[PDB]
Design an enzyme around this catalytic site. Sequence first.
Site, PDB file in Angstrom:
ATOM      1  CB  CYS A  15      -0.922  -0.001   1.217  1.00  0.00           C
ATOM      2  SG  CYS A  15      -1.907   1.496   1.408  1.00  0.00           S
ATOM      3  CB  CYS A  39      -5.431   2.582   3.186  1.00  0.00           C
ATOM      4  SG  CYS A  39      -4.280   1.820   4.359  1.00  0.00           S
ATOM      5  N   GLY A  74      42.259   8.406  -6.806  1.00  0.00           N
ATOM      6  CA  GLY A  74      41.548   9.635  -6.515  1.00  0.00           C
ATOM      7  C   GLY A  74      41.476   9.856  -5.022  1.00  0.00           C
ATOM      8  CG  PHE A  78      35.986   8.584   4.641  1.00  0.00           C
ATOM      9  CD1 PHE A  78      35.154   8.519   3.536  1.00  0.00           C
ATOM     10  CD2 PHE A  78      36.351   7.406   5.264  1.00  0.00           C
ATOM     11  CE1 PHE A  78      34.701   7.304   3.065  1.00  0.00           C
ATOM     12  CE2 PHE A  78      35.901   6.189   4.795  1.00  0.00           C
ATOM     13  CZ  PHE A  78      35.075   6.138   3.695  1.00  0.00           C
ATOM     14  CE  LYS A  93      37.562   5.337   0.685  1.00  0.00           C
ATOM     15  NZ  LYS A  93      36.105   5.620   0.701  1.00  0.00           N
ATOM     16  CG  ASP A 186      29.750   9.608   2.105  1.00  0.00           C
ATOM     17  OD1 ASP A 186      29.259  10.184   1.111  1.00  0.00           O
ATOM     18  OD2 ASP A 186      30.965   9.629   2.395  1.00  0.00           O
TER      19      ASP A 186
HETATM   20  N1  LIG Z   1      36.292  -0.280  -5.428  1.00  0.00           N
HETATM   21  C1  LIG Z   1      36.737   0.617  -6.303  1.00  0.00           C
HETATM   22  N2  LIG Z   1      37.124   0.194  -7.528  1.00  0.00           N
HETATM   23  C2  LIG Z   1      37.570   1.102  -8.405  1.00  0.00           C
HETATM   24  N3  LIG Z   1      37.705   2.417  -8.261  1.00  0.00           N
HETATM   25  C3  LIG Z   1      37.316   2.809  -7.037  1.00  0.00           C
HETATM   26  C4  LIG Z   1      36.834   1.995  -6.030  1.00  0.00           C
HETATM   27  N4  LIG Z   1      36.530   2.747  -4.905  1.00  0.00           N
HETATM   28  C5  LIG Z   1      36.828   3.975  -5.245  1.00  0.00           C
HETATM   29  N5  LIG Z   1      37.308   4.084  -6.526  1.00  0.00           N
HETATM   30  C6  LIG Z   1      37.728   5.307  -7.199  1.00  0.00           C
HETATM   31  O1  LIG Z   1      38.274   6.181  -6.237  1.00  0.00           O
HETATM   32  C7  LIG Z   1      37.809   7.535  -6.476  1.00  0.00           C
HETATM   33  C8  LIG Z   1      36.897   7.936  -5.345  1.00  0.00           C
HETATM   34  O2  LIG Z   1      37.654   7.987  -4.111  1.00  0.00           O
HETATM   35  P1  LIG Z   1      36.861   7.894  -2.721  1.00  0.00           P
HETATM   36  O3  LIG Z   1      37.783   8.262  -1.607  1.00  0.00           O
HETATM   37  O4  LIG Z   1      36.151   6.582  -2.644  1.00  0.00           O
HETATM   38  O5  LIG Z   1      35.768   9.052  -2.903  1.00  0.00           O
HETATM   39  P2  LIG Z   1      34.187   9.009  -3.150  1.00  0.00           P
HETATM   40  O6  LIG Z   1      33.898   8.132  -4.323  1.00  0.00           O
HETATM   41  O7  LIG Z   1      33.669  10.408  -3.131  1.00  0.00           O
HETATM   42  O8  LIG Z   1      33.689   8.252  -1.832  1.00  0.00           O
HETATM   43  P3  LIG Z   1      33.763   8.594  -0.258  1.00  0.00           P
HETATM   44  O9  LIG Z   1      35.229   8.439   0.059  1.00  0.00           O
HETATM   45  O10 LIG Z   1      32.981   7.453   0.344  1.00  0.00           O
HETATM   46  S1  LIG Z   1      33.025  10.364   0.061  1.00  0.00           S
HETATM   47  C9  LIG Z   1      37.163   7.481  -7.864  1.00  0.00           C
HETATM   48  O11 LIG Z   1      38.138   7.631  -8.886  1.00  0.00           O
HETATM   49  C10 LIG Z   1      36.581   6.068  -7.856  1.00  0.00           C
HETATM   50  O12 LIG Z   1      36.277   5.575  -9.143  1.00  0.00           O
HETATM   51 ZN   LIG Z   2      -2.782   0.407   3.249  1.00  0.00          ZN
END
Ligand SMILES: Nc1ncnc2c1ncn2[C@@H]1O[C@H](COP(=O)(O)OP(=O)(O)OP(O)(O)=S)[C@@H](O)[C@H]1O
Ligand SMILES: [Zn+2]
Lengths: 348, 229, 229, 279
Positions: A15, A39, A74, A78, A93, A186
């Site tokens: 629903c 409802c 990249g 965090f 990371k 996030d």
């Molecule tokens: N598991 C993964 N495989 C391939 N590329 C990844 C992976 N995780 C992150 N990346 C790459 O890393 C970069 C992102 O860096 P992150 O520190 O994960 O930032 P984000 O994507 O804004 O996420 P957060 O950290 O959770 S805010 C981009 O170029 C993504 O494509």
């Molecule tokens: Zn309902």
Amino acid sequence: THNFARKTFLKLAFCDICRKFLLNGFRCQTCGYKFHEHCSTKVPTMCRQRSTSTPNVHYWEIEASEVMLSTRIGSGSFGTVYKGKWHGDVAVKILKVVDPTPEQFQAFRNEVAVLRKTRHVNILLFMGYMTKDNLAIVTQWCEGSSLYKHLHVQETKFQMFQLIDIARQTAQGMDYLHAKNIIHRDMKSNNIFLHEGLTVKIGDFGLATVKSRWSGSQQVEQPTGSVLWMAPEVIRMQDNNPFSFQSDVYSYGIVLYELMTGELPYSHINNRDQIIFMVGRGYASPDLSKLYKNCPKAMKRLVAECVKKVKEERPLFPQILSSIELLQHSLPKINRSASEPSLHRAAH
Amino acid sequence: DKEELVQRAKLAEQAERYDDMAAAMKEVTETGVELSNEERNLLSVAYKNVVGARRSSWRVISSIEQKTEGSERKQQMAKEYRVKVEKELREICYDVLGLLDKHLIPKASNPESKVFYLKMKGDYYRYLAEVATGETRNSVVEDSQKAYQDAFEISKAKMQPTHPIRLGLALNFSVFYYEILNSPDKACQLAKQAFDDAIAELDTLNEDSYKDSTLIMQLLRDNLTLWTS
Amino acid sequence: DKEELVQRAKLAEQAERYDDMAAAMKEVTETGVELSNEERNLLSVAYKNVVGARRSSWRVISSIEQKTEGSERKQQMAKEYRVKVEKELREICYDVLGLLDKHLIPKASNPESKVFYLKMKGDYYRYLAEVATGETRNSVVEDSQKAYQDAFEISKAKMQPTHPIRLGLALNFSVFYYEILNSPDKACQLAKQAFDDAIAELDTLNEDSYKDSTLIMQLLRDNLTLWTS
Amino acid sequence: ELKDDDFEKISELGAGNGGVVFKVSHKPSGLVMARKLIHLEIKPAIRNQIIRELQVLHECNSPYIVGFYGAFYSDGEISICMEHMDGGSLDQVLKKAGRIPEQILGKVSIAVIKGLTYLREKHKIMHRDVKPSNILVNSRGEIKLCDFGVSGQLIDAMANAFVGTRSYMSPERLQGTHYSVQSDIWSMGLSLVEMAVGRYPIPPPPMAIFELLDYIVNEPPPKLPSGVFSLEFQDFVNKCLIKNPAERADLKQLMVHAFIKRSDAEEVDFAGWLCSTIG
Ligand SMILES: Nc1ncnc2c1ncn2[C@@H]1O[C@H](COP(=O)(O)OP(=O)(O)OP(O)(O)=S)[C@@H](O)[C@H]1O
Ligand SMILES: [Zn+2]
Ligand SMILES: Nc1ncnc2c1ncn2[C@@H]1O[C@H](COP(=O)(O)OP(=O)(O)OP(O)(O)=S)[C@@H](O)[C@H]1O
Ligand SMILES: O=C(NOCCO)c1ccc2cncn2c1Nc1ccc(I)cc1F
Ligand SMILES: [Zn+2]
């Protein structure tokens, strides 16, 4: 405009008002608004109960010396992502925390165990964490490009059924996450990856103890992450812990909106602080007129409810999944020109 | 007897079983009494759901059949079942068409009723058009076109452009033009002329004909937008 | 080939046509071979839809029968329609039961298959129990209770508390207790025990089957809240 | 002409939400440069547009504005080559010293006013980011502004940033109303009050960012603690911290304003003080 006609839902239907299981009710022919007979009294049309029976169905950590960090990929809110080759291609990371508090470290260990317990097709695997190279975590490497990179910088063209099944896979992943009592804080497109070209892989889930800074032995309880996908109630932070399932629902709704428009929300506002102030006060919402013309009403309705300002009105992810599968089943029927529908066949 | 039968048809409608409703209304109008507004509306909706269930089934089976034409033997069973569905779709339509030609169309003593029944006949030959292939398609679309043109002339001559049944006739006529006759330009032109001739005279609709008329206008809006090209 | 009827029934499933699916599944199980996990689910779902349509119809017809409250023949014809859909419902239930106790329950080596078939048997006997009132009501109520208990013992012994089959059997048995036997106390007791046992082993929810499990748990919660008030 | 491979980092100049700045060496000319690395992912055509609009900065040269060497896209980041600043930003000196004495505060404020007036009159380029961390001082005493909005497309791309802790935005910008150089004047005044007192003076003598925005939108502007500053500085910060842009004074009033000419008239050897407090 609601073309409500009696309909017995033989599939998985919920629903739209009480957000509970719906098996007999009234369905609107043009959009798909459904609700219970009881409802109807509490239904805000905007275009005796019988017990419900069974519905139809169908290493603790990682040593740093084992990994090798390749060229940097990249940076994020965090952490900094590096390519890894630990038992195959992985993602490492490096969290921005330099000196974790012992209580923070213990909570992070609990959460990394919790996230290690999970294993699902639609999410990235969480292998473990490291402590030698400061605080770091290891996730499954996805050779495919991110959804955000697909949508905007690469501008890969996707047909609408592809968009719909991408939304379906994302909803499946988040339904699994919420089933394990995990709040994916996030949540944005940069954390969604189109593995093998089409399969949706959700990453960077959980990790509350790491994403939020610690002011000693207690958590600061401060927002962190991208502003565009942030829920209003967590931007406001009138509560110590507003992170819940509905905040994830709002983030998924923003993802849905940018999926069905091809552009980020609040494109006319180009400053983060203004976006924070308007979203927190409710002055700004993702405007739906940007949605694709060929978008089914059901998707427009779903993305409308997913981004509701009030937390309680946001549907849970099982409902979202049910609506997406219903739309997928209805897609072959309504993929052509429309004719004269049924006229005013409404009860009461 | 007739009132009992129409009550039974309403009950079968509320009970989600439309085949009983279709049979009840069919043998309501076989008797030969003057079909009133509610009776003919119930007949049209009964046959519309009856035909539309199998029509959607045909759409689904065709779509799942055309995923990869170069596949294994399973597609033969798929096309055989689709042919079976058509064999269970063409004969129902035939029953409606014979009912129109024998009973409904002849004793139509109201131009609104006449255009309604002619729109019905055009609609059901249009339904036969999709399932028909080859020369049979051309033969059935000739009947649908003749019925639609005959409905169109009487709708111009007798009724208003804002009449919901007339608007539905124009909408279905445009759908017929660019789904089978592959005339997107003519179909869009027909939709536009119906639209502007309807909105040129507004706020004169009957209170009962408030939701339906604007609903058909919104349907025309979407169809024009869908095929603006 | 027996697989041919299998994906014929599957195609009828995605085509929304469940009458052909029911007949195809019936013919498949008539072959006397043991059903797989997919085929057994398909058969249960097919007959679930078939009986569910008639059950909704019967509920609606009974509701108008109780709603008219007049002095005419309208209630007489409503009762006639009700008894017609009732005998149709009984025919479907007896057909699926004859399939159940002659091809499925007698040949069920896997204990979970036995729980599924006994749960189906209890469900269908409950279906006949809510439509048949009188001397024959007690017999079908006893058969449903016995089948439910037989499923209950096997589920308690060799089935995990979080299995969808066990939770669904508990939900159906509690609905049987509350609706048929009109005893809310023991229905709430059984449902409470089932929910608590499910909550205890909450972490044991694999990726293959979690949605159904939590769906049943939520339905059990809703049923508890409805009963306690 | 600037490439990634031509530069190597010596240390870390600073960090922030926008990005991280590293000191690098230019081989052809042999001078140390401050290379700002802001990470952003946008269309290649948008990359070209950002580079083109940053090329406008070549002619934005002034004694009170940091120069510009070149901008290029290496990999998912817009690297901006800036004239290396030795004395860092005023944020570092706020971290080191408890509070800036009022004389150097007047000096930095007049430097900001002069530079931003220059920009408004000769380029019409909106700063939009007048912050203590965006204004820099040298060991020799040079004060210049940095990180102003020459490229509107860069602003649009950077709109998708993360949530910060503190804000220096005027109330009219948060509400989305019309914003002019008056907003930059407000921001400068808020930064000056930041400098004068020893902490972030939104709760005047643990508060959410949205809560800070609500404080600066729906509450009277803060005022410095009286008795430890001159009356001219007090009226300066009071005039600069006005919620309504109309009653707030524009650049022409700032240039003639009394605290400004009194600060200009006095000569302070603040280069030595700065070298002592940062060395
Ligand atoms: N598991 C993964 N495989 C391939 N590329 C990844 C992976 N995780 C992150 N990346 C790459 O890393 C970069 C992102 O860096 P992150 O520190 O994960 O930032 P984000 O994507 O804004 O996420 P957060 O950290 O959770 S805010 C981009 O170029 C993504 O494509
Ligand atoms: Zn309902
Ligand atoms: N030319 C330079 N010389 C020395 N240090 C510099 C130079 N440019 C930038 N920095 C440092 O690097 C930091 C980069 O941050 P900025 O973008 O200027 O401001 P910010 O602190 O990031 O403001 P936000 O709100 O966090 S975006 C500055 O705060 C300085 O500490
Ligand atoms: O960097 C910026 N603001 O800083 C806060 C977070 O980075 C910034 C912001 C907007 C902008 C538009 N066009 C260039 N823009 C910047 N860069 C920049 C500007 C002038 C100079 I001289 C040197 C620079 F690097
Ligand atoms: Zn509707």
